Amino acid sequence: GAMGASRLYTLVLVLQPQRVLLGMKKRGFGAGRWGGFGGKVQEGETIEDGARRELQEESGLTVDALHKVGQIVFEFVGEPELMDVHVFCTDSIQGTPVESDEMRPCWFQLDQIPFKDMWPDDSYWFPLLLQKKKFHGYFKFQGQDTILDYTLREVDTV
Ligand SMILES: Nc1nc2ncccc2[nH]1
Secondary structure, eight states, rough: OOOEEEEEEEEEEEESSEEEEEEEEEESTTTTTTOOOOOOOOOOOOOOHHHHHHHHHHOOOOOOOOOEEEEEEEETOOOOOEEEEEEESSSSSSOOOOOOOSSEEEEEEEEEGGGBBBOOTTTHHHHHTTTTTTEEEEEEEEEEEEEEEEEEEEEEEO
């Protein structure tokens, strides 16, 4: 049958040559995991404007440019709506990260990426992001821990 409907999300990784900024989600879905900054795209909002807005809301940072690096679709058993996540990266930041209601920020060295406390899917696509390779992925989850199926491919255009 038809693919489920999807809600549009952004995810921003602040990735510098030696380190990445991650936020620990303090409450709600995925609480206790480190990850990038993002959220739902709003009505009438361009995807990149939503990415910038969510980065500022969750981390306090504003940035010059955002680069498209991949797309990941998430599906959860028992929920018919998919998450269509557009992933971006930025290197040049202005300002200092601030703890928000949603996120507590810490920098991680790129030989200390905290996979054990990140979403399981990150082990598959985060290495591609570090290699500056664009990707499309899909992950079906049972709950927050178990992957039942996934696809992943390198692309030349997000
Ligand atoms: N990396 C990553 N973030 C996520 N957020 C919500 C659901 C699944 C997720 N995987």
